[PDB]
Scaffold this active site. Structure first.
Site, PDB file in Angstrom:
ATOM      1  N   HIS A   1      27.546   8.635  -6.250  1.00  0.00           N
ATOM      2  CA  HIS A   1      27.265   7.231  -6.194  1.00  0.00           C
ATOM      3  C   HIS A   1      28.466   6.442  -6.477  1.00  0.00           C
ATOM      4  CE1 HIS A   1      25.184   3.690  -7.479  1.00  0.00           C
ATOM      5  NE2 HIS A   1      24.346   4.009  -6.834  1.00  0.00           N
TER       6      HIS A   1
ATOM      7  N   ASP B   1      26.647  11.985 -14.169  1.00  0.00           N
ATOM      8  CA  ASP B   1      25.725  11.004 -13.850  1.00  0.00           C
ATOM      9  C   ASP B   1      24.394  11.754 -13.401  1.00  0.00           C
ATOM     10  OD1 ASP B   1      24.214   9.198 -12.278  1.00  0.00           O
ATOM     11  OD2 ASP B   1      25.847   8.981 -10.598  1.00  0.00           O
TER      12      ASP B   1
ATOM     13  N   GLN C   1      19.649  10.525 -11.075  1.00  0.00           N
ATOM     14  CA  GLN C   1      18.782  11.095 -10.289  1.00  0.00           C
ATOM     15  C   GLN C   1      18.015  12.169 -10.633  1.00  0.00           C
ATOM     16  OE1 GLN C   1      17.973   8.792  -7.537  1.00  0.00           O
ATOM     17  NE2 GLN C   1      16.214  10.308  -7.205  1.00  0.00           N
TER      18      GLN C   1
ATOM     19  N   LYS D   1      14.408   3.971 -12.995  1.00  0.00           N
ATOM     20  CA  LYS D   1      14.356   5.256 -12.095  1.00  0.00           C
ATOM     21  C   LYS D   1      13.325   6.309 -12.583  1.00  0.00           C
ATOM     22  CE  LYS D   1      18.165   4.961  -9.187  1.00  0.00           C
ATOM     23  NZ  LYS D   1      19.608   5.588  -8.888  1.00  0.00           N
TER      24      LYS D   1
ATOM     25  N   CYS E   1      24.606   3.395  -1.411  1.00  0.00           N
ATOM     26  CA  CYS E   1      25.714   3.205  -2.430  1.00  0.00           C
ATOM     27  C   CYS E   1      26.533   4.636  -2.366  1.00  0.00           C
ATOM     28  CB  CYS E   1      25.143   3.293  -4.116  1.00  0.00           C
ATOM     29  SG  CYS E   1      24.279   1.500  -4.017  1.00  0.00           S
TER      30      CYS E   1
HETATM   31  C1  LIG Z   1      20.588   4.726  -9.048  1.00  0.00           C
HETATM   32  C2  LIG Z   1      21.962   5.662  -9.400  1.00  0.00           C
HETATM   33  C3  LIG Z   1      23.233   5.270 -10.087  1.00  0.00           C
HETATM   34  C4  LIG Z   1      23.281   3.879 -10.312  1.00  0.00           C
HETATM   35  O1  LIG Z   1      22.347   3.425 -11.400  1.00  0.00           O
HETATM   36  P1  LIG Z   1      21.662   2.005 -11.746  1.00  0.00           P
HETATM   37  O2  LIG Z   1      20.452   2.373 -12.695  1.00  0.00           O
HETATM   38  O3  LIG Z   1      21.615   1.290 -10.660  1.00  0.00           O
HETATM   39  O4  LIG Z   1      22.975   1.396 -12.702  1.00  0.00           O
HETATM   40  C5  LIG Z   1      24.051   6.262 -10.186  1.00  0.00           C
HETATM   41  N1  LIG Z   1      23.940   7.321  -9.688  1.00  0.00           N
HETATM   42  C6  LIG Z   1      23.084   7.832  -9.015  1.00  0.00           C
HETATM   43  C7  LIG Z   1      22.950   9.463  -8.735  1.00  0.00           C
HETATM   44  C8  LIG Z   1      21.893   7.186  -8.808  1.00  0.00           C
HETATM   45  O5  LIG Z   1      20.662   7.409  -8.332  1.00  0.00           O
END
Ligand SMILES: *Cc1c(COP(=O)(O)O)cnc(C)c1O
Ligand SMILES: *Cc1c(COP(=O)(O)O)cnc(C)c1O
Ligand SMILES: [Zn+2]
Ligand SMILES: [Zn+2]
Lengths: 135, 405, 405, 137
Positions: free
Chosen positions: B122, B199, B202, B225, B362
C-alpha cells in the site's frame, strides 16, 4: 434506470469518438481522474480568440471518453468566452441546477443523466477540467 | 460458531436501501462498519465521562484516564505484546508507519544501506521509505513477486543482503488477498542485521495477531478497518527499539521536564503521544476489540475463508472475469470484467445497491505489475453472507450482458 | 437562547459526582459536547460511514460530501480565503509540529532566530526547541510584564532582522491574557519573519478572523470547542503551504506513486495522509454550527461576565492569590496559601467541582511566577454564576478544612 | 468527613518531614508526578545492597511529600530487593487488594486511605516510583 445514464448517444461517442489524436504546435494539457482509471490528454490550437481545432487522446470509462468526444466536437469554432460558458453550464448540469439553455450543447445534453450518478461527475468533468486549465 | 443473522443485527448501517435494493456492502477493505457496542461506547464516553486524561485530580478525569489506559491494555492483549510500553496510540497505520520512518529509519540509514519492500505494498508502506532513503542517501529495493502474486522465501533471501537495515512488508495485501510469510521474513531480516516493519492494517481485523510469535520489530494497524472508530490506530514496536528512538512529535503529555531550551521525554509509551490524545477513539477501539474477541478471530477467519472460496468458485463460472492473486487468500477479490471499465462495473453494482471499490486501491505499483490501469474489488467481513456474493455475481452477469447486447 | 437551554443540550452536565451536582470548571483542559455533536457521530456511524474521496458507491459519496462540507465550515468559521488553506490534523499539537517539521526546518540556518514567549503552552515550545537544535538556529524568549501580559515594545526589542519565526499563543491557558496577535504579526512581517499562532484557547471562546489577524499559521483543537476528540485544524497562507513539503506520506496525499518517486496532491490534501479523521471532522463541523448558532460574540460576553463575577468574588475571599490581569478570558488560575492545589482539587471534587491542578502544560510560566503548582477554574458557555458561588464556598470549606489540622 | 482519610500520621509527615535534604556520593533519581505538580529529588546513599541513608527534597501536595517522608524513614536501613517487595505491596495496597501484611513495613499504611481518591494514587506512588528506578540496574 441505468438507461437514463447510458444513453444511445453516449454509447456512440464511446464506441466511435470524434476528435481522436494529439496535435501539433498547440497547448496540450493532460489530466487524470483522482478516482483512478480515467486519463485524458487534451490538445487545443487556438486562433487568436477562437478554437480552430480540439483533439484528445485517452483511456477510461464510457462516461469520461464520451464526454471528451462530445466536448471536443462542441467546441470547434466556438470562442474562448463561449467555451468557458459551456463549461460552467456543464458543471451546473452535473449538479441539480437549472442552467441557461441559450447556447446549444447538442449531444452534450445527453450527459444530463449523470446528475443522478454523482460518482461519475468527475468522469464527465475530466474533459472540461482539461479545458479550464487550458486557458 | 457465528450466527450471521445475530451478527448483522448489531450493525444499524446494514439495514437500509440504496436505489430500492437492500445495501450490499462489499467494501470493508476500504473501511469497516461498526456494531452498536462500539457506537454506544462513543455515546457513553461523551454522555457520561469525557474529561482530559492523565494530568488530573477530578472524578470524571479518573474515569476518562482509566478508559484510555484500559484500552491500551486491551490492544496489548489483542496483539500479544509483552508490555504496555510497546503499544502507542496514533492517528492510523499511515501515521504509525511514518513514525517508524521519521524516528527509526532516519537514525539508522547511512549511504549503502537498504530498505527492502514489496511490489504489493500500500502507498502508506511505500512513500515514507521513499522519503527516508532520500533523506539518508540509502537505497530502496523491491522483493519480486511470483506469477500468482505471492512472495517466495527464496526471493526474500535473494533481495535481503547484509546492507539491509529495514524490511517493510504488508501482512495481507489489500488488493491480492495474499497472506505474506511474515514470521519467516522476520527471521531473514534478523539474519541480515535488519529489522522488520509489518503493515498489518489488512490482517489485524480478520486474523489473530501474535507479535511475539511473529517476532516482528514494528507492527501498524488501523481501528477503522476492524469495526473501530475512524482516526485511531496503533504502532507496536519492541520496547528496546522504542527506548532509543526519538519522538516523532513534541508538545504536552510527552514531556517530563521542560526548561527554556531543553526538555526530557516521558517514559514509554507516553514518549510517543504528544498533545491531548484520541481519547474517545482509543476507548472505542478497545470496545471493538472486545466485540471481535467475543466472536473470536479464528471464527472470523473461518467465515471469510468460506466466503472467499465461495466467491472464487462462483467467479470461475463467470467467463470474461479475471481475478488477480492466488487461491488461498483473505476475504477479498480484486477483478476485472473484460472490455468493461471498472467505473462502469461499479456504477451498475451501486445501482443494485452493491458497494465495491474501483481504481488502484492505493497500490499503483501493484497495478503496473499487473499491467492494468484499474480494477474493481469486493471485500468481505464478518457481516457478509453467501447471499450477498450471489447478488454480486448476478450483478456482474447483468453488467456483462448490459454492455455487450 | 438562555443559559438553561444551552445546558439542556449537554447530557454530561446532568449528573451527580460524590452526591453533588457536577460542577465542571475544566473547559480549558477539554470541553463537553452538545447532543447536536454526539448525534452527528451517531448518524455518521449509523447511516453513511464509508471511505472518502476516490469513490464509487452511494455511502462513499455521502461520507465524502460530509468530510469536505466540514472543511468548508472550518474555512468560513475562521475566515480563511480558501479551502486549500484548511488542513485537518489530529489537534493543535500536531498542527504546530507540522509547521516546525515542514516550515521551520526548511527555513532555519545558523544565525536565524525563533521567537516565542514565557507563557507558551508546551505544544508551542518543544517543536521550536527541536527545530533550532536540528538547524543550528537560536530560540529567543519575549519577556513578559510583571502582570503576565506582553508589551509591543518587548516584542520589538526581541524580534530582529535575523528572526525567521515568531510563535505565540492567541490566549494564554494559564493567565487568561489575550495577546496582541495582529500587532505582533505586523512586527514579524517588518523583520522578514512569519508568525505562528497557537489558537487552541482562543478559537472556542472568541471570533477568529485569520485575514484580519494576518497570521501565517493558526492551529486549533476540536476537543476544546465542543467538538470530538482527536481532531484539529492547521491553517496556513496558501503561498506558504505550496512550498512546504508534506509532514507525512502515504495514500490520499498523492497524485502518482511510482517505485522510487511520487508526486503530491494539490492543497489541502497534500497534508492529509492516510484514511482521514472522518467522523471527527464531520463532528467538528457540527460543533461549529452549534457555536455559530449561539454566536461567538455572545459566548465571549458570557465568559467575560463570569470571569468578572469570579474575580470580584475571589479577592473578597482572603488568602487567594490570582495570577494575571483584570481583563481576561473565561478562566482563573489561583492558589490558596499553604494548601497545595492537588489538595484543593481533592476537596473541590468531593463537592462535585472539577478544576485542574499543576503546571497546565506551561512549566516555564510556573517558574516565571515563582510557583511549583497552581489551581485553575475555567468557564464556558454552559457555566453559571451559581457554579462560581459553589466554587468559592468550596474554597472556603477547603481553607477551614486545612486549618483544623 | 470522608476526607478524614488524610490521616493524623499523614498530616504529621506533611507538617514535619523526615529525611529532608540532599545526599552526596549517591544514587540520584529525579521524578515528577504524571499528575503534574509534585516533584521529588530522591537520593539514596547505599552500603552495598542496603540504603544506609535515604533523603529527599521536593515540592508538592500533602500526600506526595508525606509518602516520601514516610518512605525515606521506612527505607532507612532496608535490606535486599525486599525494598521492591515493599513497593509491590504498596501498589497492591493502592488498588484495594490485600497483601503479605507485616514484613515490618514501618508506619505509612495510613496511605491505605487513598485506595479511595484514586486521583491521588500517583501522588502517593511518586516516591516509590523513584525507588524502583533507583535500583533499575
Ligand atoms: C488501509 C491500509 C493502509 C492505510 O491505513 P489508514 O488506516 O488508511 O492509514 C495501509 N496498508 C494497508 C495494507 C491497508 O489496507
Ligand atoms: C490545549 C492547548 C494546546 C494543545 O492542544 P491539544 O488539543 O492538546 O493538542 C496548546 N496550546 C494551548 C494554549 C492550549 O490550551
Ligand atoms: Zn471514470
Ligand atoms: Zn499531588
Amino acid at each position: 434506470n441505468l438507461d437514463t445514464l447510458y444513453r444511445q448517444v453516449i454509447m456512440d461517442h464511446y464506441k466511435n469518438p470524434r476528435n481522436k489524436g494529439v496535435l501539433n504546435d498547440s497547448i496540450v494539457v493532460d489530466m487524470n481522474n483522482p478516482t483512478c482509471g480515467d486519463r485524458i490528454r487534451l490538445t487545443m490550437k487556438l486562433d487568436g480568440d477562437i478554437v480552430e481545432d480540439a483533439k484528445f487522446e485517452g483511456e477510461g470509462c464510457s462516461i469520461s471518453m464520451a464526454s471528451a468526444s462530445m466536448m471536443t466536437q462542441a467546441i470547434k469554432g466556438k470562442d474562448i468566452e463561449t467555451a468557458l460558458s459551456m463549461s460552467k453550464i456543464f458543471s451546473d448540469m452535473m449538479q441539480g441546477k437549472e442552467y441557461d439553455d441559450s447556447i446549444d450543447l447538442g449531444d452534450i445534453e445527453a450527459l444530463q443523466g449523470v446528475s443522478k450518478f454523482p460518482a461519475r461527475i468527475k468522469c464527465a468533468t475530466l474533459s472540461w477540467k482539461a479545458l479550464e486549465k487550458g486557458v | 460458531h457465528m450466527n450471521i443473522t445475530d451478527i448483522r443485527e448489531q450493525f444499524p448501517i446494514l439495514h437500509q436501501q440504496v436505489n430500492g435494493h437492500d445495501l450490499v456492502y462489499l467494501d470493508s477493505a476500504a473501511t469497516s462498519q461498526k456494531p452498536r457496542a462500539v457506537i454506544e461506547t462513543l455515546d457513553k464516553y461523551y454522555n457520561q465521562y469525557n474529561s482530559n486524561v492523565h494530568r488530573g485530580v477530578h472524578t470524571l478525569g479518573t474515569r476518562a484516564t482509566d478508559g484510555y489506559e484500559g484500552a491500551r491494555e486491551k490492544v496489548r492483549k489483542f496483539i500479544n505484546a509483552k508490555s504496555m510500553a510497546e503499544i502507542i496510540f496514533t492517528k492510523g497505520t499511515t501515521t504509525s508507519l511514518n513514525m517508524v520512518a521519521l524516528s527509526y529509519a532516519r537514525a539508522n540509514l547511512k549511504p549503502g544501506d537498504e530498505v527492502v519492500i514489496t511490489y504489493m505494498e500500500h502507498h502508506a508502506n511505500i512513500i515514507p521509505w521513499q522519503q527516508a532513503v532520500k533523506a539518508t542517501g540509502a537505497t530502496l529495493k523491491y522483493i519480486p513477486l511470483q506469477e500468482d502474486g505471492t512472495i517466495s522465501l527464496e526471493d526474500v533471501r535473494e533481495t535481503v543482503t547484509s546492507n539491509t537495515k529495514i524490511v517493510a512488508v504488508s501482512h495481507v495485501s489489500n488488493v491480492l488477498g495474499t497472506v505474506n510469510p511474515i514470521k519467516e521474513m522476520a527471521k531473514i531480516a534478523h539474519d541480515n542485521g535488519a529489522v522488520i516493519v509489518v503493515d498489518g492494517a489488512q490482517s489485524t481485523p480478520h486474523m489473530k495477531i501474535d507479535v511475539q510469535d511473529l517476532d516482528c520489530d514494528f507492527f501498524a494497524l488501523s481501528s477503522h478497518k476492524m469495526c473501530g472508530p475512524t482516526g485511531v490506530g496503533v504502532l507496536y514496536g519492541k520496547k528496546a527499539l522504542l527506548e532509543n528512538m526519538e519522538p516523532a512529535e513534541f508538545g504536552g503529555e510527552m514531556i517530563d521536564f521542560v526548561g527554556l531550551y531543553e526538555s526530557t521525554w516521558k517514559e514509554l509509551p507516553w514518549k510517543f503521544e504528544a498533545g491531548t490524545p484520541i481519547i474517545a477513539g482509543a476507548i472505542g477501539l478497545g470496545a471493538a476489540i472486545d466485540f471481535l474477541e467475543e466472536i473470536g478471530l479464528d471464527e472470523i477467519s473461518r467465515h471469510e475463508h468460506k466466503l472467499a472460496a465461495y466467491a472464487l468458485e462462483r467467479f470461475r463460472q463467470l467467463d470474461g472475469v479475471t481475478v488477480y492473486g492466488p487461491e488461498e487468500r483473505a476475504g477479498l477479490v480484486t477483478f476485472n470484467l473484460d472490455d468493461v471499465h471498472p467505473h462502469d462495473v461499479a456504477t451498475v453494482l451501486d445501482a443494485e445497491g452493491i458497494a465495491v471499490r474501483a481504481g488502484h486501491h492505493c497500490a499503483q505499483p501493484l497495478m503496473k505489475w499487473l499491467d492494468v490501469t484499474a480494477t474493481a474489488r469486493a471485500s468481505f467481513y464478518l457481516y457478509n453472507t453467501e447471499e450477498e456474493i450471489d447478488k454480486l455475481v448476478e450483478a456482474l452477469q447483468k453488467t456483462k450482458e448490459y454492455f455487450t447486447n
